[PDB]
Design a protein around this ligand. Structure first.
Ligand SMILES: [Mg+2]
Ligand SMILES: [Mg+2]
Ligand SMILES: [Mg+2]
Ligand SMILES: [Mg+2]
Ligand SMILES: [Mg+2]
Ligand SMILES: [Mg+2]
Ligand SMILES: [Mg+2]
Ligand SMILES: [Mg+2]
Ligand SMILES: [Mg+2]
Ligand SMILES: [Mg+2]
Ligand SMILES: [Mg+2]
Lengths: 141, 145, 168, 65, 70, 206, 106, 63, 143
RNA sequence: UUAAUUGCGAUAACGAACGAGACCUUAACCUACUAAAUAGGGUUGCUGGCACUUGCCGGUUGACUCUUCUUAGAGGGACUAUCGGUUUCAAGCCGAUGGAAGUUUGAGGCAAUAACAGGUCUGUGAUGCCCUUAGACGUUCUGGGCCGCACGCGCGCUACACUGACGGAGCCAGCGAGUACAACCUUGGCCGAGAGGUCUGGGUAAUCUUGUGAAACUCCGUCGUGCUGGGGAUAGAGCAUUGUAAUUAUUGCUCUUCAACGAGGAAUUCCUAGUAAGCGCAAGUCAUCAGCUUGCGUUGAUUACGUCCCUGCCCUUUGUACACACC
C-alpha cells in the first residue's frame, strides 16, 4: 500500500536489494544499520550517497537492504549502488523530477559509478597458465 | 600494564638448568632459549606459575623459578595430560617421561644410540648422515652435515 | 536406476555410443550409417538408418531379432521394451558415413583408388551437395606414406556452420 | 579495430543500390528497413549492415561517392 | 642486538620528563630517541593516555599516533 | 547545523562533517592550488572525493589516469610488492594515517604537503637509452607530464618502503616524513635525491 | 465422481533446448484445453558437466586442453490435477530425446 | 635554477629507435611565438606543459 | 525510540559481554583452560589465556542470535583458519571440535542458548534479555 | 587504414570461394513480458525479547498475495551511436555526450592451402611387416624397483617479517561434486587438546551436505627492527586414519629439533584490466596422499596504449653453382 521501490545494487558478483519505504528514516542492511558495514574504512563510502544529497531526503525515505554473494569490498559497493538508486527511484516515482535531476547532477559530478551499474566481470582462467593471461614459465637453457 | 618502577636492575642472566635464561624479554621465550623447550610447551608452563606473560620476568622471584623447574622435572605429578610430552611410551611396561634442558640433549643422544643399536632403516640412515623419512635428495640440499 | 539425472543421461549417451560403434562393426556388409534411439515409457524405438535395408531386416524378423536380444543381454533389458526399425536413408550421398563405408568396401574389394574417390564425389554432387571432399591416406603404392585428396565445391572448415552443415 | 567486413560492405552497397529510398539517415529506422528487405540470419551482422548503410547515407548528404 | 631494551627507574623518570610538549607521539618516534623497545614504548604510550597529558589522534594497532593536550 | 533524526542513529561528530562542506575523510578538500603549469590538470585537487578508494575505470583510454584522485594514486603505489599486492584497504588505512601525521605536523592542510611533495619530486629531464651504432650513449629527453607525476608517486613510496624494511618507522611515518622533506625542499629524502640524481644526469648529457 | 487430486510433478531434463522448450509449450497448451490449476513451466539451473582433458594421446608437444562439456536443461511443470488427467497428458505430448518423467506423489 | 616553462603546439610523431620517445614542437609560455622541436619521454597531448632546465637546444630524430 | 543489539559494534559488544560474564563468574569452566590449542592450526594457545573463554562464548552467543540454527561444526568451520602447514601452501581446517561444544553446553545451562529442532541451537528468552541490556549499556558508554 | 589479403584507393584485370570476419558458447543490461512453499520478499496469525505509546529486531513453510534480486525462457540492445575536430573531408582513426556494454564489447570454440620423416606402434581386437609363441617377450601370483644420490639443469611451493608475526574478535564468495547394490557427500548429538571416533539422519541433489558462513582481509591486544615471537627444514617419540600390507616417515595430529635464508650474480620468464600479483576454494587423478591441474570466485595496482633498438616471424625487391632445399 505504502509508496515503495526495490532497488538492487551490484559489483563483480555481489548483490544488494535495497527496499525503500515511507516513515521516519531507517537505512538498514541485513537487520544491522547503515553505521556498521564493518570493513570500517569504507563506512564513509556508504555514507557518501547520503551526505551528497543530504540527510533531509531520509526524513521521509526509509531504506532496508539484504546482501548476498561477492566479497566484503564488493558487497560494500553492492550496498552503495543499491542506496544511490534507492533515492533516485523514489524521487523519480513519488517526488518531483527536478530533484531527481539535481540528484543525478550531484551523482554525475561525484561519479564513482554509484548510479551506473559496474561493467567488470572476471575473465576465465584459460589454460597454459596460472590465471587468465598469466602464462607459465618456458625454459630453453 | 605497568612500567618498571623501583630501582630495578635485578640481574641480566640468570642461569637455569645448566643453561642461560636471558634477562628481560619474557619467561616463555627465555624458556625457548633453553635446549629442549618450545613455544607451546613454555606457554603451558607459564600458566602453572601464574605469572603475567606481559611481564619481562628477568626480575623474577626465586620461588617462582623453583616451581617452573619442578614443573619441567615432573609431568605426571602436576596437571599435565602426559601426551603433551617430548618422549612418551619407553623402556618395557610403564610410564611416559620427558626432559627440557641438558637432560633432554642427553636423552636424545641416548635415543640416537638406541636407534644405532637396533640398526633400523631409520638408524642406518642416521649412521650415514642422510635422509631418514623417505625424502628424495636427488636434487634438494647439496651441502649436508 | 534410479540414478542421478546427470549420471543417467551420460550413461544413455554412452549406451548409444556403444550401440553406434557395435552397429558400425556388426552391420558393415549392410551399409549402416547411424542410430536414432528414442526412449519413451515402456517401449524404446531404436531406429537404425542403413543403405541395404532388406539385408538389415533379413527375411521378416531374423537379423533384427538377433540384435534386439543382444542389446537386452548387454544392458539387462527384457523383450517388448526394445523394438528395432530398419529404414532407408533420405538420399545416401548427403550422409558421409554411408559414403565412408562404400569407399571402405570399394578399396577392400578391388578398384582404382583415384577413380573410386572421383566416382563417389560425382555421386555426392549429383545427390545435392554444395561441396565435398575425400582424403585417403597411408601408402597408395610405394613404401613412404602420402595423403591423397579428391574434392569438389565450397568446403567450409571453420565456424559453427560445420556441425550443422558438414557431415564428417 | 572496427573495419566493417566485405559482406557487410557488399550487401550495404547492393542495399543502397536497390533502395536509396526507404533509408532515413538515422540508424534504428535503417536497421528496421534492413531486416525487412535483405534476409540476414544473424543479429549482429544485420546491425553491422545497418551501421554501414547509415555511414553511406551520411556521406550521401555531403555529395556523391 | 642494538640495546635500548633494558627497563629501569632512571629510564622510567626520563620518559615522564620527555612526555609533555611533544608534537609526534608514537611507537616509532619514542624508539627514535633510543628509548625502551617497541612494546615497552607502546606500554609507555598507554600510560600517557591514563589521565590526559597526551591525547590521541589515531587508534590503530601499530599505527598509534598521539599529540600533547592543548 | 541541523542534525536530522534518522531512525538508524548516526554519531554527532559524523552528522556535523556532512552536507554543508564537501570535505575529505574528516577535514576539508579545498585549496591546494599548485601554481606550476604541467602539473595542473593532472595533479587534480579540483575533483573532490570523500574516500581514497574507487572501482575507477581509469586504466582503459589513455589520459583517464590524470582524472584519478592523487590520494588514490598514493594508495595504489603503496600496494607495490607481492606481499602487499592488492589490498587497498590496508593502503587506504596507511594513507589515512599519513594525512593525520601531517595535520599534527605544524598544523597545515595535509593535502597541501602531499601535492607540494609531488611537485618537487617530479623530474624535469630524464635520459633514455638510444642505439646510435652500438655504444650506450644517453640523450637527455624532456619528461612530460603524467610521467613526472607517475615517477614522483613511485619515487615517494619507494622512499617509504626502503625505510620501512627492517624498521619500527611505520610506512605512514616514513611516507609522511618523505612528503615533509619533499614539501620543504631539503634533499634528504629518497624521492628528491633521485630527482636530483637525474638532473645532473640531464646536464651531463647536453 | 472421483476428482481426487494427488498433486503431480512433471520432470523434463534434456540436452537439446529447442525441443525441450517446444515440449514444455505443448504440455501447458494441453493443460489450457483440459483447464487445470497448475504452476507454470519452472526452470531449474542448468547442470553443465565439465570433462577437462588434454587433447593428446602421447602427452608430448604443447600442453593443450579440451573442456568437453554437456548441457542439461532441468524443468518442472507442477499440476494440481487428478490421476486420470495425468494419465492422459502422459499418453500424448511425447517427443524424441527429451526425458519425460512423472513424480506423482505431491 | 633558471627554469624555462614550455608548452606544446604539435606532437610531431613518435620517434626514436625504441618506442618511448616523441618529437614535439614547443611554443613556450612566457615570450611566445619562438617554436622549437624538442623531444619528449612520456605520454603527450596538445596544450600540455613541459618543465625543463635547458630550453634553446633543438633535438633531432634519434638513431 | 527503540534499543537494539546491532547498533553496538561487535568488538565493543563482546568486550562488554565478557566483562558481564566476569562479573557473574557463573558461565562455568570446561576443564582444558590454557592446556588447549583452540584452533587445530595455531602455534600458540590464546595470549589472554586467563579470561578469554568468556569472550569466546559471547561470540558464539551473538553468532547464534544472528543465525537461525547453528551447530558445532559450523562454528568450528567459521572459527577455523590457515595452517602454517610448512613449506607447503596453506589449507582450511575446522577449529577444535570439543571446545566449541563446551562453549555451547555452558551457554545452555546459563540460559543463553536453547535447543532448536531440525538441526542445531537457537536463543532462549532470558538470553535475549542480557543481549539487549549489554547493547543498552555499551550505547550509554558511547554517549 | 585494419587485429586480419581488413578495407578505401590507385589499377589487365573483373567478379568469386576458402582462411579472417560472420558464426557459436559464454560473461556483461532489462523495476518491459512469461514463472516459482526445491528462488526470494511484503502484510498478517501465533509467538521471543525490548524500549515500554503508536515503534525495533526476530522465529515459524500458520495464512494471503507479489517477482525487484534469483534462476531461465523468449526477446531486444551497440551500430563506433550522436556531436566535435582529424584524415584525398575515403577507409578509418582521436576526443566529449549519453548509454549496462564504445579494448573485434570481454573471453574463448572452430580454424584454410600445404605440409613436418614433430609425437604417438606404452589410449586403443587401429594396424603393416620384422619378434615371440610354453624354460614364453603371453598371462598370472610373491617380493622388490621406479622415490636410490658426489652432482647438473627444468616447472613449482615456503620464506627471508614490523604493508609483519602471533592470539582472539569480526566474518563475505563462486565454480563445483556427491551412494541402493552399494558404501558417496556426509549436517545435527555425545566422546577425544588433537587427528579422529561413534550413534543417528538429509540427500540420486537450485531441496541435504552448503549461506560449502574458504582464505587473504577488517578490529583490539602480545613482540618490537637480534637468524628474534621471522623461517620452517632436518630429526626423535607417540596418538590417529586408508588399505590385505605403511619401514624405503602414505597422510593427519601431538610435543620436542630448531638448519639454510636480512630480497639473490650472469641470465631470463609472464604480463596491458576485474587483467597482473595476492589469497584461498574446486573437481581431475583418489582406497589413502596436493607443493600438481583444469575450473572458480576474493583482494586488486603499477606502466604503455608506442616502436621496430633486440628476439622471432612475415612479406617485398634483390642474389643463389641450393630443390633430400644452409644439418
Ligand atoms: Mg568462412
Ligand atoms: Mg572464426
Ligand atoms: Mg606463513
Ligand atoms: Mg574473440
Ligand atoms: Mg612422424
Ligand atoms: Mg604389437
Ligand atoms: Mg618418476
Ligand atoms: Mg606447467
Ligand atoms: Mg548447494
Ligand atoms: Mg627459532
Ligand atoms: Mg613461432
Amino acid at each position: 500500500t505504502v509508496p515503495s521501490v526495490q532497488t538492487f545494487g551490484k559489483k563483480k558478483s555481489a548483490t544488494a536489494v535495497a527496499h525503500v519505504k515511507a516513515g521516519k528514516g531507517l537505512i538498514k542492511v541485513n537487520g544491522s544499520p547503515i553505521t556498521l558495514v564493518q570493513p570500517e574504512i569504507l563506512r564513509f563510502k556508504v555514507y557518501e550517497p547520503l551526505l551528497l544529497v543530504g540527510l533531509d531526503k531520509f526524513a521521509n525515505i526509509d531504506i532496508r537492504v539484504k546482501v548476498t554473494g561477492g566479497g566484503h569490498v564488493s558487497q560494500v559497493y553492492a550496498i552503495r549502488q543499491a542506496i544511490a538508486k534507492g533515492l533516485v527511484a523514489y524521487h523519480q516515482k513519488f517526488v518531483d523530477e527536478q530533484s531527481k535531476n539535481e540528484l543525478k547532477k550531484a551523482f554525475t559530478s561525484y561519479d564513482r559509478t554509484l548510479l551506473i551499474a559496474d561493467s567488470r566481470r572476471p575473465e576465465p582462467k584459460k589454460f597454459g597458465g596460472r590465471g587468465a593471461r598469466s602464462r607459465f614459465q618456458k625454459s630453453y637453457r | 600494564s605497568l612500567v618498571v618502577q623501583e630501582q630495578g636492575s635485578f640481574q641480566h642472566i640468570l642461569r637455569l638448568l645448566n643453561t642461560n635464561v636471558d634477562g628481560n624479554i619474557n619467561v616463555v621465550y627465555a624458556l625457548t632459549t633453553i635446549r629442549g623447550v618450545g613455544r607451546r610447551y613454555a606457554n603451558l608452563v607459564c600458566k602453572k606459575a601464574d605469572v603475567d606473560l606481559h611481564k619481562r620476568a628477568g626480575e623474577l622471584t626465586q620461588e617462582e623459578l623453583e616451581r617452573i623447574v619442578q614443573i619441567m622435572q615432573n609431568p605426571t605429578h602436576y596437571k599435565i595430560p602426559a601426551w603433551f610430552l617430548n618422549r612418551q611410551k619407553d623402556v618395557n611396561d610403564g610410564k611416559d617421561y620427558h626432559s627440557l634442558a641438558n637432560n633432554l640433549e642427553s636423552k636424545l643422544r641416548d635415543d640416537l644410540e638406541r636407534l644405532k643399536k637396533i640398526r633400523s632403516h631409520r638408524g642406518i640412515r642416521h649412521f650415514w648422515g642422510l635422509r631418514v623419512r623417505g625424502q628424495h635428495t636427488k636434487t634438494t640440499g647439496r651441502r649436508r652435515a | 536406476a534410479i540414478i542421478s539425472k546427470k549420471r543417467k543421461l551420460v550413461a544413455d549417451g554412452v549406451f548409444y555410443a556403444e550401440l553406434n560403434e557395435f552397429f558400425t562393426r556388426e552391420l558393415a556388409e549392410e551399409g549402416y550409417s547411424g542410430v536414432e534411439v528414442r526412449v519413451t515409457p515402456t517401449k524404446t524405438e531404436i531406429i537404425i538408418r542403413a543403405t541395404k535395408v532388406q539385408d538389415v531386416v533379413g527375411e521378416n524378423g531374423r537379423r533384427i531379432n538377433e540384435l534386439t536380444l543382444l542389446i537386452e543381454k548387454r544392458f539387462k533389458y527384457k523383450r517388448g521394451t526394445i523394438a528395432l526399425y530398419a529404414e532407408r536413408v533420405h538420399d545416401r550421398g548427403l550422409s558421409a558415413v554411408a559414403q565412408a563405408e562404400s569407399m571402405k568396401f570399394k578399396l577392400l574389394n578391388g578398384l582404382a583408388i583415384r577413380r573410386a574417390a572421383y566416382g563417389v564425389v560425382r555421386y555426392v554432387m549429383e545427390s545435392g551437395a554444395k561441396g565435398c571432399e575425400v582424403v585417403i591416406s597411408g601408402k597408395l603404392r610405394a613404401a613412404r606414406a602420402k595423403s591423397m585428396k579428391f574434392a569438389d565445391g565450397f568446403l567450409i572448415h571453420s565456424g559453427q556452420p560445420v556441425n550443422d552443415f558438414i557431415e564428417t | 579495430g572496427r573495419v566493417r567486413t566485405k559482406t557487410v560492405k557488399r550487401a550495404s552497397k547492393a542495399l543502397i543500390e536497390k533502395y536509396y529510398p526507404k533509408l532515413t539517415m538515422d540508424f534504428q529506422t535503417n536497421k528496421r528497413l534492413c531486416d525487412e528487405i535483405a534476409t540476414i540470419q544473424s543479429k549482429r551482422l544485420r546491425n553491422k549492415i545497418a551501421g554501414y548503410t547509415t555511414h553511406l547515407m551520411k556521406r550521401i548528404q555531403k555529395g556523391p561517392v | 642486538a642494538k640495546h635500548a631494551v633494558v627497563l629501569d627507574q632512571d629510564k622510567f623518570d626520563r620518559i615522564m620528563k620527555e612526555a609533555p610538549t611533544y608534537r609526534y607521539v608514537s611507537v616509532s618516534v619514542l624508539v627514535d630517541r633510543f628509548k625502551l623497545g617497541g612494546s615497552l614504548a607502546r606500554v609507555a604510550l598507554r600510560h600517557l593516555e591514563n589521565e590526559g597529558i597526551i591525547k590521541p589522534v589515531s587508534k590503530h594497532s601499530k599505527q598509534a599516533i598521539y599529540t600533547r593536550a592543548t | 547545523f541541523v542534525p536530522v533524526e534518522l531512525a538508524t542513529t548516526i554519531p554527532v561528530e559524523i552528522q556535523q562533517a556532512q552536507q554543508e562542506i564537501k570535505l575529505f575523510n574528516k577535514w576539508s578538500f579545498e585549496d591546494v592550488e599548485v601554481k606550476d603549469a604541467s602539473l595542473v590538470d593532472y595533479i587534480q585537487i579540483s575533483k573532490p572525493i570523500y574516500v581514497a578508494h574507487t572501482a575507477g575505470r581509469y586504466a582503459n583510454k589513455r589520459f583517464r589516469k590524470a582524472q584519478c584522485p592523487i590520494v588514490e594514486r598514493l594508495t595504489n603505489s603503496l600496494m607495490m610488492n607481492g606481499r602487499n599486492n592488492g589490498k587497498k584497504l590496508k593502503a587506504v588505512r596507511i594513507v589515512k594515517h599519513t594525512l593525520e601525521i601531517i595535520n599534527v605536523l605544524t598544523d597545515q592542510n595535509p593535502l597541501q604537503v602531499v601535492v607540494d611533495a609531488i611537485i618537487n619530486s617530479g623530474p624535469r629531464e630524464d635520459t633514455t637509452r638510444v642505439g646510435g651504432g652500438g655504444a650506450a650513449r644517453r640523450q637527455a629527453v624532456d619528461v612530460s607530464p603524467l610521467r613526472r607525476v607517475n615517477q614522483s608517486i613511485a619515487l615517494l613510496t619507494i622512499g617509504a618502503r626502503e625505510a620501512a624494511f627492517r624498521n619500527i618507522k611505520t610506512i605512514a611515518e616514513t611516507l609522511a616524513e618523505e612528503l615533509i622533506n619533499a614539501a620543504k625542499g631539503s634533499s634528504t629524502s629518497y624521492a628528491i635525491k633521485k630527482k636530483d640524481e637525474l638532473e645532473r644526469v640531464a646536464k651531463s648529457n647536453r | 465422481q472421483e476428482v481426487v487430486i494427488h498433486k503431480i510433478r512433471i520432470n523434463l531434463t534434456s540436452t537439446k533446448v529447442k525441443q525441450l522448450e517446444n515440449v514444455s509449450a505443448n504440455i501447458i497448451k494441453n493443460a489450457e484445453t483440459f483447464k487445470l490449476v497448475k504452476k507454470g513451466p519452472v526452470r531449474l539451473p542448468t547442470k553443465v558437466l565439465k570433462i577437462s582433458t588434454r587433447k593428446t594421446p602421447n602427452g608430448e608437444g604443447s600442453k593443450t586442453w579440451d573442456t568437453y562439456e554437456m548441457r542439461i536443461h532441468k524443468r518442472y511443470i507442477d499440476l494440481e490435477a487428478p490421476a486420470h488427467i495425468v494419465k492422459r497428458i502422459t499418453q500424448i505430448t511425447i517427443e524424441p530425446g527429451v526425458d519425460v518423467e512423472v513424480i506423482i506423489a505431491a | 635554477t633558471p627554469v624555462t616553462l614550455a608548452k606544446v603546439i604539435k606532437v610531431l610523431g613518435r620517434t626514436g629507435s625504441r618506442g618511448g620517445v616523441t618529437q614535439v614542437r614547443v611554443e613556450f609560455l612566457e615570450d611566445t611565438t619562438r617554436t622549437i622541436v624538442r623531444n619528449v619521454k612520456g605520454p603527450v597531448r596538445e596544450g600540455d606543459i613541459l618543465v625543463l632546465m635547458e630550453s634553446e637546444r633543438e633535438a633531432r630524430r634519434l638513431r | 525510540p527503540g534499543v537494539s543489539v546491532r547498533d553496538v559494534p561487535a568488538q565493543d559488544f563482546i568486550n562488554n559481554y565478557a566483562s558481564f560474564l566476569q562479573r557473574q563468574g557463573k558461565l562455568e569452566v570446561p576443564g582444558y583452560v590454557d592446556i588447549v590449542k583452540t584452533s587445530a592450526g595455531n602455534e600458540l594457545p590464546p595470549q589472554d589465556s586467563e579470561g578469554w573463554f568468556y569472550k569466546r562464548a559471547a561470540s558464539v552467543a551473538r553468532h547464534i542470535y544472528l543465525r537461525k540454527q547453528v551447530g558445532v561444526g559450523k562454528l568450528n568451520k567459521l572459527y577455523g583458519g590457515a595452517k602454517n602447514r610448512g613449506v607447503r601452501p596453506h589449507k582450511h581446517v575446522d577449529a577444535s571440535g570439543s571446545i566449541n561444544r563446551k562453549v555451547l553446553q555452558s551457554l545452555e545451562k546459563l540460559g543463553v542458548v536453547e535447543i532448536s529442532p531440525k538441526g542445531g541451537r537457537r536463543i532462549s528468552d532470558n538470553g535475549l534479555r542480557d543481549l539487549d541490556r549489554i547493547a543498552a549499556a555499551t550505547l550509554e558508554d558511547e554517549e
